[PDB]
Amino acid sequence: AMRDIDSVMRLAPVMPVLVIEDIADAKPIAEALVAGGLNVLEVTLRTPCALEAIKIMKEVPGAVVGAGTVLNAKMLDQAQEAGCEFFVSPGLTADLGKHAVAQKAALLPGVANAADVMLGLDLGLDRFKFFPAENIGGLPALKSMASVFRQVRFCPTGGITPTSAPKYLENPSILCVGGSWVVPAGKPDVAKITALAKEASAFKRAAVA
């Protein structure tokens, strides 16, 4: 079912993009985000501990944990074995997309141009990250792409801010945005993380009442 990732995208306005450099912060970070209503969590596989951080965050009730920076079929298998509910990649290859479809994995691949979208449509996928959004033309570029691909829906990620997120979310083709601002670099301050998540959780979306 390719509808799975579409449902996940509509659960929350903002999907935190987590880079967990200290594994001891994994549980407090997931707890603070879930407490703010941003329970759909992308744990990027950019760090040595990341699979163990995914297993820790899965222990938080209500956390919907996915793996990010899934670059190939082997990383998808390792993430799926760790119990990830969805998978995010910066871009799309035919090998990754065919493996995710064969494995029934809810993949949310990044796209930057029309050729990336067309490859995903050929694989049966029609939901994508627009990444890195602010470096590939931003909202005006996403609007031109959404105008061409009427059945596709998007999650812009890359340079999104609390100021620009509602502007992206006004577009009916945008289901959510990705961002790292909800977890500031440095030692986690769970009260500030929860407050930023509560604010992002309240963002209005044209696509989701």
Added chain:
Amino acid sequence: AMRDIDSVMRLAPVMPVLVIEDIADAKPIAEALVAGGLNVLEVTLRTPCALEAIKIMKEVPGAVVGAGTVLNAKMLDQAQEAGCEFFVSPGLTADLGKHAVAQKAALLPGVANAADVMLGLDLGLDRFKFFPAENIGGLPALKSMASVFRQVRFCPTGGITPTSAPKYLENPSILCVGGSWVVPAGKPDVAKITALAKEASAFKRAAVA
């Protein structure tokens, strides 16, 4: 013959990009454009009626009707069966390009970066839309690409305006531009459409005397 699409690109300075939301406007729009000298028409397959609009516009003498937003081999077959003389896509996949070559279809695929051009060259194609032009660096980005791919020629599309079109057309590597400004959104005003087409038809081109 891969030369077919190159000839089509040189016929008119501007190729209208048509989004026909009301099929009753198809004939008056094609008639007004042809009367202005912009007879090379891209009817995007973004709307339910679009194949029927293509059949209507083919009835206009002098209209050279193509299909746009051709995303896959099946859409190309449906457009070719409707009698389209050429085919436009926002991007290029190997499956679409190999099918167009096998079917002898005059395809004008979009490209946004060097990898897209190299895939097209591998398929035997050397004429592309540069799309969406104004969101992927515009004329300066197209100049860098044309400097690298000396044998390739381009049709920038996406954000082109009557003001910027001559500036793109000064570049000898650019054969034409694509635009939607010639048909304003709303109920067609055939006198205004014809006047805008006559102005675009007069645009000077370094590549075409």
Added chain:
Amino acid sequence: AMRDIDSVMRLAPVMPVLVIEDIADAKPIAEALVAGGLNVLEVTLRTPCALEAIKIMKEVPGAVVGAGTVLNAKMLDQAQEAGCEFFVSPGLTADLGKHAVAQKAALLPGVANAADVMLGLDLGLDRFKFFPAENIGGLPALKSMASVFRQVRFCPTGGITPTSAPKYLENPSILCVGGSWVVPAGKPDVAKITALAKEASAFKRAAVA
């Protein structure tokens, strides 16, 4: 050994991108660059004489000559037969990358977005040109990409200037930059070329002491 191209990238801060329109300038240009310490030379295959210019520049002691604008496996074979030590392409296709790996060719393919990097990683490559850098978001776009692909290292090329080159070179993920400014258009002035190469040779790099 995929480490070969990484070693080549660290040899000099700047890799001249040479477009040799007059073959008689090939030897004086290579001699002037090597005398300035920019001995890693990319001779683009954009000109009819380019393979003969590569053979001429190989005669200069200390010149490490590569071919640029290598668009397909056949051009790589012609360059490798001419004795090129490395190979540069504006973008990457699976056919070009698989051929370079099979032929043990030190390929430095261009990338513009995450899908291009992921294809290269799938082929066993992790060193790329970021091209054309200043038209695809520049340093901010390269920073977002280097943040995602922690094991990848880059050579930005396209619009780099003596002013911006040190700013790119401050990033530890950047090993070198590509540029054409060291050889100004027109008849070569070997004293000016050597002076510009000596200045670029002195550029500081976070990645290379």
